[PDB]
Scaffold this active site. Sequence first.
Site, PDB file in Angstrom:
ATOM      1  N   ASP A   1       0.831  -1.189   0.000  1.00 20.24           N
ATOM      2  CA  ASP A   1       0.000   0.000   0.000  1.00 20.24           C
ATOM      3  C   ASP A   1       0.876   1.254   0.000  1.00 20.24           C
ATOM      4  O   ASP A   1       2.100   1.187  -0.138  1.00 20.24           O
ATOM      5  CB  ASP A   1      -0.973  -0.032   1.181  1.00 20.24           C
ATOM      6  CG  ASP A   1      -0.279   0.097   2.514  1.00 20.24           C
ATOM      7  OD1 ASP A   1       0.783  -0.528   2.692  1.00 20.24           O
ATOM      8  OD2 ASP A   1      -0.798   0.820   3.388  1.00 20.24           O
TER       9      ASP A   1
HETATM   10  O1  LIG Z   1      -3.262   5.265  -0.600  1.00 23.35           O
HETATM   11  P1  LIG Z   1      -2.850   4.626   0.702  1.00 23.35           P
HETATM   12  O2  LIG Z   1      -1.372   4.329   0.672  1.00 23.35           O
HETATM   13  O3  LIG Z   1      -3.608   3.336   0.889  1.00 23.35           O
HETATM   14  O4  LIG Z   1      -3.215   5.641   1.945  1.00 23.35           O
HETATM   15  C1  LIG Z   1      -4.140   5.191   2.891  1.00 23.35           C
HETATM   16  C2  LIG Z   1      -4.943   6.370   3.434  1.00 23.35           C
HETATM   17  C3  LIG Z   1      -4.525   6.612   4.880  1.00 23.35           C
HETATM   18  C4  LIG Z   1      -4.648   7.614   2.603  1.00 23.35           C
HETATM   19  C5  LIG Z   1      -6.432   6.015   3.354  1.00 23.35           C
HETATM   20  O5  LIG Z   1      -6.671   4.856   4.103  1.00 23.35           O
HETATM   21  C6  LIG Z   1      -7.339   7.138   3.866  1.00 23.35           C
HETATM   22  O6  LIG Z   1      -7.791   7.928   3.108  1.00 23.35           O
HETATM   23  N1  LIG Z   1      -7.674   7.239   5.272  1.00 23.35           N
HETATM   24  C7  LIG Z   1      -8.539   8.309   5.727  1.00 23.35           C
HETATM   25  C8  LIG Z   1      -8.266   8.624   7.194  1.00 23.35           C
HETATM   26  C9  LIG Z   1      -6.861   9.081   7.573  1.00 23.35           C
HETATM   27  O7  LIG Z   1      -5.921   8.529   7.119  1.00 23.35           O
HETATM   28  N2  LIG Z   1      -6.671  10.191   8.487  1.00 23.35           N
HETATM   29  C10 LIG Z   1      -5.324  10.612   8.826  1.00 23.35           C
HETATM   30  C11 LIG Z   1      -4.825   9.943  10.104  1.00 23.35           C
HETATM   31  S1  LIG Z   1      -3.852  11.158  11.039  1.00 23.35           S
HETATM   32  C12 LIG Z   1      -3.067  10.373  12.475  1.00 23.35           C
HETATM   33  O8  LIG Z   1      -3.730   9.980  13.373  1.00 23.35           O
HETATM   34  C13 LIG Z   1      -1.550  10.226  12.535  1.00 23.35           C
HETATM   35  C14 LIG Z   1      -1.026  10.258  13.967  1.00 23.35           C
HETATM   36  C15 LIG Z   1       0.401  10.795  14.049  1.00 23.35           C
HETATM   37  C16 LIG Z   1       0.467  12.282  13.711  1.00 23.35           C
HETATM   38  C17 LIG Z   1       1.835  12.894  13.986  1.00 23.35           C
HETATM   39  C18 LIG Z   1       2.056  13.206  15.463  1.00 23.35           C
HETATM   40  C19 LIG Z   1       3.517  12.989  15.847  1.00 23.35           C
HETATM   41  C20 LIG Z   1       4.453  13.989  15.176  1.00 23.35           C
HETATM   42  C21 LIG Z   1       5.683  14.289  16.026  1.00 23.35           C
HETATM   43  C22 LIG Z   1       6.978  13.932  15.307  1.00 23.35           C
HETATM   44  C23 LIG Z   1       8.137  13.739  16.280  1.00 23.35           C
END
Ligand SMILES: *OP(=O)(O)OCC(C)(C)[C@@H](O)C(=O)NCCC(=O)NCCSC(=O)CCCCCCCCCCC
Lengths: 88, 110, 67, 128, 124, 459, 178, 80, 98
Positions: free
Chosen positions: A43
Site C-alpha cells: 500500500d
Molecule cells: O493510498 P494509501 O497508501 O492506501 O493511503 C491510505 C490512506 C490513509 C490515505 C487512506 O486509508 C485514507 O484515506 N484514510 C482516511 C483517514 C486518515 O488517514 N486520516 C489521517 C490519520 S492522522 C493520524 O492519526 C496520525 C497520527 C500521528 C500524527 C503525527 C504526530 C507525531 C508527530 C511528532 C513527530 C516527532
Amino acid sequence: SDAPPLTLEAIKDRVLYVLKLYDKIDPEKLSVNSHFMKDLGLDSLDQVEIIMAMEDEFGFEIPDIDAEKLMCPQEIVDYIADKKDVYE
Amino acid sequence: HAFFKAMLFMCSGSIIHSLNDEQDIRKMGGLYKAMPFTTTALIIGSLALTGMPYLTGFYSKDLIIEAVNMSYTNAWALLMTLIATSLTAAYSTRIIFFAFLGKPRFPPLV
Amino acid sequence: VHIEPRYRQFPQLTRSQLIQAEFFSATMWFWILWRFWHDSDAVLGHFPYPDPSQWTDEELGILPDDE
Amino acid sequence: SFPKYKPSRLATLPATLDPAEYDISPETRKAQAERLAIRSRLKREYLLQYNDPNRLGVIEDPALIRWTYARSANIYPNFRPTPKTSLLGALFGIGPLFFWYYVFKTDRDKKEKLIQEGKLDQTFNISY
Amino acid sequence: GAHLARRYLGDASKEPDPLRMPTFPPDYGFPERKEREMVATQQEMNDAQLMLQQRDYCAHYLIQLLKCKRDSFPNFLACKHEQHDWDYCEHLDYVKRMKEFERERRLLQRKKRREQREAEMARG
Amino acid sequence: MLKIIIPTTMLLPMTWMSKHNMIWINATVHSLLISLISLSLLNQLGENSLNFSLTFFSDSLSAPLLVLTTWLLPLMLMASQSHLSKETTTRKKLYITMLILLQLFLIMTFTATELILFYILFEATLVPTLIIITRWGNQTERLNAGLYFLFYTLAGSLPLLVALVYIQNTTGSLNFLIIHYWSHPLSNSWSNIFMWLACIMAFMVKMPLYGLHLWLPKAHVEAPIAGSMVLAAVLLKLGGYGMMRITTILNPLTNYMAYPFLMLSMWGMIMTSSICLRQTDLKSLIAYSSVSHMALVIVAIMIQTPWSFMGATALMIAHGLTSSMLFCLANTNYERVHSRTMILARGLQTLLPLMATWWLVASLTNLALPPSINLIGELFIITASFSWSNITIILMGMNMMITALYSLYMLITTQRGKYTHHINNIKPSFTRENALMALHILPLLLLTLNPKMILGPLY
Amino acid sequence: AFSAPAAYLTHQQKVLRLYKRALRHLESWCVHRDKYRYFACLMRARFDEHKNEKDMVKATQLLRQAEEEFWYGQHPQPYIFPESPGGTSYERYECYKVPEWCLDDWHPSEKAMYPDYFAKREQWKRLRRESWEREVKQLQEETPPGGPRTEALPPARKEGDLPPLWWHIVTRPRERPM
Amino acid sequence: SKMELPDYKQWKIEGTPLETVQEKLAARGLRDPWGRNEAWRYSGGFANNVSFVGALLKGFKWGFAAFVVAVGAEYYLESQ
Amino acid sequence: SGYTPDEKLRLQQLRELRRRWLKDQELSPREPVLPPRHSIFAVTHVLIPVWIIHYYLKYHVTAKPYTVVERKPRIFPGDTILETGEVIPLMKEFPDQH
Ligand SMILES: *OP(=O)(O)OCC(C)(C)[C@@H](O)C(=O)NCCC(=O)NCCSC(=O)CCCCCCCCCCC
Ligand SMILES: CCCCCCCCCCCCCCCCC[C@@H](O)O[C@H](CO[C@H](O)CCCCCCCCCCCCCCC)COP(=O)(O)OCC[N+](C)(C)C
Ligand SMILES: CCCCCCCC/C=C\CCCCCCCC(=O)O[C@H](COC(=O)CCCCCCC/C=C/CCCCCCCC)COP(=O)(O)OCCN
C-alpha cells in the site's frame, strides 16, 4: 580522491539489495519490472517507507512530488541515474 | 588555544571529508576504530581543551581559573565562568560520544 | 596507498595508522604520568594554607579586652 | 492537547496549520484550477522563447518592468496630500533635524561654557 | 569563602571592609612594631625593570631568579631553587596579609564587644 | 599656465580636421599628452601659490583637481567611443567638441584668480553638459533631467552673482589674494546673513546639499556614460572648490550659520545612504552614494579646521576616481543587457571574472578600505568632527556601516549567485573595457603611495 | 522537481507527506537505529489505526490534529541531507555551472584544442535547429484554444521527432561540473 | 576494482538490540520489517565498541609501562 | 499513482537524449591539443630578501635618529658593563630565611 564514478549496474544492484532486505517482499518474487502495488500487493505507506529507505541508502532526498510516482525498481534506478548524470 | 582548537577543526574536517561531506553528528557512528589517528588526535585535543593536567590547555586555563578565584571581582562573573568551565567538558563529551562511540549511522557505502 | 570501498564492511585499515595512533596516545599518557610524578605540586599545591582561627591573640597583637 | 502557535509578521503561519486548507469548497477548487492555468500559460510563453535557437539577448519580462516603474516613476502621480502623508512627512523630515540640532547645540554650548570658565583638559590638544 | 557569608548575611559592621583597611592604628594592640625590611634598593629594581607590581618586599628573590634564567639560557630547567625561594617569599607575604586581615577582624570584634558592654554599664 | 590651456584649444581643430576613422585615436593620444603636461603642476610651494600671471594661479588644492580633469578626459573618450559607433562623423566630432570645451572651461575655472571670472566659467560649464545630456542621452527622461540640472544650478547661482558684484563694489576687489589679505570679520546682521546665504547657496546646490539634491539622480542616471563620469568626478567638486575659496570672507558668521546645513549634511548622510539599500537601479545607487560622500565633504568644509580641509580635499579626489570607475563598470553591464535593473543580470563573476575583480576593487575602495585615500579623507573628516563635537561619531559610524552594507550588497547582487538563464548575449570583456578599469584604479593606489599630493594647502 | 505539479494535493497526498515528515523528525529525535525502528513501527501502527475510516470529515479533522501535534513536537534542528534545500552543501556547486552557449564565445585558438568535441557540438546544434519547427508545430496542435491547463509537456509522437522543449533539459551543465 | 556486494542472506538481526526491538514490538502485535536493513551496523567490525572512559584511556598501558621504566632508570641513576 | 504513459514516454526520450549528450561530453585521447637546483629556494626566497632588508636597515633606516629604538638591556646586581667596565654591587646581605 572522492567517490568512484557510480554506474547503472551499481544502482540497480543496490536498489534490489535494499528491496530484498524488506520483510514485506518475497526475494524470489521481486524483479526489476515488479510493480509495488500490483506485483507485490503493498500500500501507499509501504511505498513511502521504501522511498525513505532508498533515500537513506543513496545519501540524497527525493521530493514528495517526484517520489510518490515511483512504483517499480526500474523507475527508481532511472530516477537516481538521471539525478546523478549516470549515462553508462 | 590556537594549537588544540586548530587541530580539533582539522580532525572535524577529516571526519567530514571521509563521510561523504557529512557534518551532522547524528549520522557519525563508530569512528573510534574506523579512524584511529583521527580519534586519538580528537581525544587529545578535547583533553587539552578541558584543562587536563600537564597539557597545553592546562598551563593557561587552570592558571586563569585560579586567578579568577583569587581576585576582587564580580560574584556573578565568577559563577558564570565556573559553569562555563563545566559546560566545556559537557560539549567535549557530546562530540566524542556522538561521533566516535556506538554503532555506524552513515550510509552503507563506506 | 590504495584502499577500496567495502559496502557495509568495516573499512580496510593499515598497520601504519594504527601504530602511529597508539604511539601518540602512549606518548600523551606517559608525558602526563611523568610530569605529575615530577611536578605534582602544580596540581596539589606546594605551600600549606594556614588557618586564621588557630592563630593566638598575642602574635596578632591584641590586648585581653582591658582598655 | 498542546500549546498553540501564534503567528506574527516576521514569523508567519505554516500551511499545514492554516484552517483555510482543511475546509475546501468547489469554488476554491476551481479557483486553484484557474490559478494553475495562468501559471502554466505564463510558463509556456516563457519556455517557447527560452528554447528558441534563433533568440539572442534578454527575454523581456513585463512583470519586472512593471515593478521597477511602480517603484520609481509611478509614485508621485499617485501621491495625494492627506493628513497621514502630511504628518508623516513633517515628522520624518523635520523631527530628526530639530532633534540633532538641539543635541549638538546643547553639547557645544556646554563645551564652550566650560572653555570660557576655564577647565576642559585641553592639554596636548594641538591638532584640531 | 565563609567570610563573605558572614559579611553579606551577618553583621557586616562586625566584619572588616576589604577596601577601607586598616581601620585601627598599627600600634593599637602591639607594644612594639618593627618596620618591614626591604632588601633590594630602588635603583636595582629600576635597572632590572621588574614591573610596577613586582616591586614588593620580595623583589630580591625575583631579581635573583631573573638573573639565573638569563645566565643559564639553553637549560631552562636549571632555575628551580630560585623559583622556589621567590614562591616561598610571596607565600610568606600572603600569610602576613591574611594575618593583618584576621587581626583587623578580631579588633573590630573586640571594639564591638567593648562598646556593647560600656553601653550596658551605662544602662544602670 | 597657458601651456595647458592652449593645447586643448588645439585639440579642437585637430579633432575637426582629422579623418573619419582616426578621431578617437588622435583625441586619446593628445589628451593623454596634455594630462602628462598638466602633471607638472603638482610641484607646489609650501607658503604661497603659483601666481603664473595676473589672471591665472595655482595652489595645492587646484592642482590635483586639474590633474583629475585632464586625466578624466581620455577615460571619457575611451568609454564613449563604444555607444557612438553608429553615429555620423559630424556628430561624433560634435560630441568630442563638447567634451573638449567642458575640459577647457574646467581648467580655466580651477585656476581663475578672481571671483567673477571663476563664476563666469563655473556657469559656462553648464552648456556643454546640458547639450551632452539632452542630445545623447538614451531615454525620454533626459529632457527633464537637463531641465532640473540647469534650473537647480541657476536658481542658486544668480544670487551668488549679485552678492559678488556687491562685494566688489564694497571692498574694491575680488582677486583671491587681495580678498584673503584684506579680509575683515562679518558682523551679525540680517544683511550679512543674506550675504552669507547668497555666497554659500550656489555651492550648496552644486555639491548637492541634502534637500537640494533631487537633480543629481535624474541627471546622472539619464546621461550618457561620459556625462555621468564628468558629473560625478569633477562637476560635483566645483562646489567644494568654491566653498573653500569663499569661506575666507564669511567668518565669523559661519560659526552659527553652518548649524542648519551641518544637520542637513549629517542626518542626510544617513538618509541617502539608506536609500542605496533599496535601490532597484544601479546608476541611482551610485548617484545616491555620491550624494552621501558629498554630504561628508560639506561637513568638513563647514566645521573649518585644517584637518577637515585636508580630509575634504582627499575625499573629493578619491570620490571622483571611485564614482567614475563605478559608473563605467555599470555601463559595461548596461551595454551587455540594455537594462539598468540590478537583479536582471546576476552571477556575472562566473562569466566575467576579470570584470568581477574590477567590481570588487571598486567596491572595496568605495566603502573606504584602508589605506586608500578614500579612508584617509573620511577619517580626517571624522576626527575633525569629533573635535567639533564628540556626539558626531554616532552618525559617522552609522554612515560607515551603511556604506559597507550597500557597497557589498551591490557587489553580491551583480556578481555572485547564479547567472540568469535566458541571458545569452554576454560576450567576453573587451580590451578597451579592461584598460579603462585599470586606468581608473591604478592612479588610486599610486596616490595612496604618496598622499600628500592630494591633501590640500593645509598640509 | 521534474514533475509538473497539480492544482491541489489530495487528502492521501497530504497524509503521506505528513507521514514522511513525522518519520524524518522522529529519526532526528531518536538518533540510534534500533530506537528509531521501535518508535517508527509504533508510528506506523498509529497511522494504520485510522486508515480504514470512511467518514471524510472526521478524517480531515484528525489530520488537522495530527498537524498541530507535529508542529509542537517537531525537532528544532531536523537532520537535512547535505545537498537538500536546507543542507550544508545545498548550492555549493552552482558557481561551477557554466551555460553551454558560453562555448560559442571561445577564441578560435581555444577551439583548436578539443576539435572532436566542437564537431559533436556542431552536430547537436544542427539537430536542434532542424527539430525546432516540428517541436513548435506539435506544441501548437495539442493545446486547447484557451491555453494549457497544466505545465506538463507531451512527448514526441513520430519516429523522427524529438520531445518538444528539450534543449535546456538535455544540456544541463552537470551535478558536479568541475 | 569492480567490487561486488556481499550476500544479502548473511544479515541476521539475531544477537543485536534489533532482537530486543522485535520482541518488544511482537509483545504488542507489531512487526519491524526493516531490521535486516540495519543489521550490518552491528555484525562485522562494528560488533563491539569501547566505552567513553575506555576511549579516554586509549594508550594508557604503553604509557604506564614506559613511565615505570623511566622512573626506575632515574631512581637507579642515584647510585653515584 | 505513478507515471502516465505520456509522462513515461517523455521521460524515456529525454533520458536517452541526456545520456547521449553526457557521453558526447567525454574527451578523445588527443583532445587537449597543446600548441608547441637542490637548494635554490633558500637562496632566492630567504638569502636575497634578508640581504636587501639588512642593507636597507643598516645603511638607510639607521642613518636617521630614533628610527630603530631598542629596549634598554636589563642590569642585575653582579654584572659588568662591557664599555664602562664597572661592576654592579651585590644585593645587600640576604637574610637567607629558608
Ligand atoms: O493510498 P494509501 O497508501 O492506501 O493511503 C491510505 C490512506 C490513509 C490515505 C487512506 O486509508 C485514507 O484515506 N484514510 C482516511 C483517514 C486518515 O488517514 N486520516 C489521517 C490519520 S492522522 C493520524 O492519526 C496520525 C497520527 C500521528 C500524527 C503525527 C504526530 C507525531 C508527530 C511528532 C513527530 C516527532
Ligand atoms: C531643502 C533645504 C534647503 C537649504 C536650507 C537652508 C536653511 C537656511 C536658514 C538659515 C538659518 C539662520 C537664519 C536666521 C538667523 C537667526 C535664526 C532666527 O531664529 O533668528 C532669531 C530671531 O528670532 C526670530 O526667529 C527672527 C526671525 C523670524 C523670521 C524667520 C522665520 C522663517 C521660517 C523658516 C523658513 C524655511 C527656510 C526656507 C525658505 C524657502 C535669533 O534671535 P536673535 O539673536 O535676536 O537674532 C540674531 C540675528 N540678528 C542678530 C541679525 C538680528
Ligand atoms: C535650488 C534653490 C536654491 C535657492 C537659493 C536662493 C536664495 C539664496 C539666499 C537669498 C539670496 C538673496 C541675497 C541678496 C544678495 C546679497 C547682497 C547683500 O547681502 O547686501 C545686503 C542686502 O541684503 C538684502 O537686501 C537681501 C534681501 C533679500 C531679498 C530676496 C529674497 C529671496 C528669498 C529670501 C528667503 C529665502 C532665502 C533662503 C532660501 C534657501 C533655499 C531653500 C546689504 O545691502 P544694503 O541695502 O546696502 O544694507 C546695508 C546698509 N543698510
